[PDB]
Amino acid sequence: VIVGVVENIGEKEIVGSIFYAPYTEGLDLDDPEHVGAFKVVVDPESLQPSIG
Amino acid sequence: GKYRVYIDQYAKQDYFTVGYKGPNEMDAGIYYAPYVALTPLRGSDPKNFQPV
Amino acid sequence: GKYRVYIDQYAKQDYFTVGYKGPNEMDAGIYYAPYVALTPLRGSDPKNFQPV
Amino acid sequence: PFATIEESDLELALQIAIVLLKVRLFSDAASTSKFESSDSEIADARFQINKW
Amino acid sequence: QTAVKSRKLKTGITVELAQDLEANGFDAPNFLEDLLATEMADEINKDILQSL
Amino acid sequence: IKKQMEAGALVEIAEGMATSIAELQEGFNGSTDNPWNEMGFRIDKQVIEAKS
Amino acid sequence: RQLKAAYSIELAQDLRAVHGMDADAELSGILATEIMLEINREVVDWINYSAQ
């Protein structure tokens, strides 16, 4: 059993256990909430695509 | 008046073959159903950059 | 008004070299013949997604 | 660890350590340099579909 | 002060599997991107709920 | 060989490829020793000279 | 003549952030410029090589 606190009073005063804070600022993305873009390669020996 | 004659190019010894073909695609005797058409694929190897 | 002087920045010594350049592109001394301009090539590794 | 914890069963003794801070879950995101050295054993996602 | 870390996933398919998925009912490209999204979203919970 | 084909002993047959074998072409899923089949072209020249 | 370059995706993010320049364009702006310098050096090098 774990009891914690989350409090975002406003502006820059955001306090709470374990801050997470994902980092995607500047990357060309679809929607502001995607948090990371995909990637396709297609290996050359075979031709079946892969996604990362 | 009746028979469509196709000439087998690479006939080995000698033969003529008769057969039937109805209007509906079910009265054939041999069915050739393609599933996926000729799909082209392209890729590259990031060690020689040569297209394949 | 007779000679044109070009500066060799990466000179291991102190030297000058005199030469001739005809009005025609044929009588010029050494021949520099480009064939294909710079061509970019881009790709990514199959199983680690790192572009090259 | 597992010296003060006299629990005979392994899993419960493992449970005791977590609450006693003797050992810690290693659920952690890798450092940035791990997936860059061109020798990157990247995790694989698997799925399967069975019908009822 | 903390330095951000990285989480990476990669599954890939084969064209033959993708071809039947549209025939079998699913939407292969959209579905696969949802496969990665769910696991990575779930994989964050194991990094937060196991960090507290 | 011709005579045997005459008495229905040997019959000409052209067949496709198994999907599972066709899917794992050149290293996919860790497969080994299974190349594609490739077709290239060559360009060659002849020369003649006038007689007298 | 040819040259290669290897930049990581995460570097592209960090370089685009923090400083504010695209990591991709720099390497293209480096390799292409570097090759032209070497050729421009080779032309100068041959002249002194062949000079009496």
Curated annotation (Swiss-Prot), chain A:
PTM description: Proteolytic cleavage at the N-terminus by the prohead core protein protease gives rise to the mature capsid vertex protein.
Function: Capsid protein that self-associates to form pentons, building the capsid in association with hexamers of the major capsid protein and one dodecamer of the portal protein. The capsid vertex protein self-associates to form 11 pentons, building the T=13 laevo capsid in association with 160 hexamers of the major capsid protein.
Family: Belongs to the Tevenvirinae capsid vertex family.
Assembly and interaction partners: Homopentamer. Interacts with the portal protein. Interacts with the major capsid protein that forms 160 hexamers.
Name under which the protein is recorded: Capsid vertex protein
Organism: Enterobacteria phage T4
Encoding gene per record: 24
Swiss-Prot record, chain F:
Signal sequence segment: none
Post-translational modification, as annotated: A proteolytic cleavage by the prohead core protein protease gives rise to the mature major capsid protein during virus maturation.
Domain of life of the organism encoding this protein: Viruses
Subunit structure: Homohexamer. Interacts with the portal protein. Interacts with the capsid vertex protein that forms pentamers. Interacts with hoc; one hoc molecule associates with each capsid hexamer. Interacts with soc; this interaction reinforces the capsid structure. A total of 960 subunits of the major capsid protein forms the 160 hexamers.
Function: Major capsid protein that self-associates to form hexamers, building most of the capsid in association with pentons made of the capsid vertex protein and one dodecamer of the portal protein. The major capsid protein self-associates to form 160 hexamers, building most of the T=13 laevo capsid. Folding of major capsid protein requires the assistance of two chaperones, the host chaperone groL acting with the phage encoded gp23-specific chaperone, gp31. The capsid also contains two nonessential outer capsid proteins, Hoc and Soc, which decorate the capsid surface.
Family (UniProt): Belongs to the Tevenvirinae major capsid protein family.
Name of this protein: Major capsid protein
Curated annotation (Swiss-Prot), chain G:
UniProt modification remark: A proteolytic cleavage by the prohead core protein protease gives rise to the mature major capsid protein during virus maturation.
Function, as annotated: Major capsid protein that self-associates to form hexamers, building most of the capsid in association with pentons made of the capsid vertex protein and one dodecamer of the portal protein. The major capsid protein self-associates to form 160 hexamers, building most of the T=13 laevo capsid. Folding of major capsid protein requires the assistance of two chaperones, the host chaperone groL acting with the phage encoded gp23-specific chaperone, gp31. The capsid also contains two nonessential outer capsid proteins, Hoc and Soc, which decorate the capsid surface.
Family (UniProt): Belongs to the Tevenvirinae major capsid protein family.
Subunit structure: Homohexamer. Interacts with the portal protein. Interacts with the capsid vertex protein that forms pentamers. Interacts with hoc; one hoc molecule associates with each capsid hexamer. Interacts with soc; this interaction reinforces the capsid structure. A total of 960 subunits of the major capsid protein forms the 160 hexamers.
Name of the protein this chain belongs to: Major capsid protein
Species the sequence originates in: Enterobacteria phage T4
Gene, per the UniProt record: gp23
